[PDB]
Amino acid sequence: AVPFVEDWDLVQTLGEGAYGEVQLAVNRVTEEAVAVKIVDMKNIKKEICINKMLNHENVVKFYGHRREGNIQYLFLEYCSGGELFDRIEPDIGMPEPDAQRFFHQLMAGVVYLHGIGITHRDIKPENLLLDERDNLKISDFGLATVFRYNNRERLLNKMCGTLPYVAPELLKRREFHAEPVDVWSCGIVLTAMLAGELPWDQPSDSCQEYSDWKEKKTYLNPWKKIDSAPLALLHKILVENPSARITIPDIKKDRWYNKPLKKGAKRPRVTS
Ligand SMILES: OCc1n[nH]nc1-c1ccc2c(-c3cc4cc(CN5CCCCC5)ccc4[nH]3)n[nH]c2c1
8 A cells, every 4th residue: 555656667678579669667666677568469468378377487477467558568577687698609609507507497497388388489598588696587478379288288380489499390390299399499599508609590401501410510610619418418409300309308317417517606705
């Protein structure tokens, strides 16, 4: 019953796009920050529906929405760290330990989503945000859909995603399982974090870069910059046949995935 507590000031645009804009909003009274997605209306109702069933530390939180005419307002968790995209150095990537930690968190979020029958369908660095403690959070469920309901799996057929990150079966088959597709895009994200470049414009035999990969020419630019341990994992994720592709439970058993590399975030320290 505190006056003004429901007032939010839009401080700045966090990002724009065909679906509208996302702005940083600060509470007039508490100064708490949240991200407000503004949709001009003229998918959205489905996005809200999907967001309402999400609750995980590696998934951007949904606080609520307000119709107010033809402009939908989505109140979402503000991730002060920005996009994972900006943590990747062009043609370099990032330190392996950091990439491993981010990959661990990405897997946690994906395991959660798949557990409740939801597939993201557009996993990429631009959609992976970081909070104040660099914790990764999966965002933007505008392309997400239910692939399992009442314990029955529904095969997908809709062409969704972003070419460099899309699995080859989405371009070669009429129908396909949802989960291996998200696993594949996570592998491309791992490649990007470790090499600072995408392997191919798209996973097609017509694409020379892709053909080279299937021929195991790992001495080529992308893969040459990646250590043997994480590369062995990528060899299991970027497998053309989705039925032979490694699943998440098995990714969790992979040698590199479990290799001690990253230390704590530090905080104390004083001698004598
Ligand atoms: O699932 C949630 C969702 N669905 N759709 N959109 C989202 C969605 C999109 C973006 C964000 C963000 C966010 C974007 C962002 C960008 C920067 C970079 N900075 C911005 C100001 C100018 C200088 C550069 C820094 C921190 C940021 N935090 N937080 N929460 C979001 C939710």
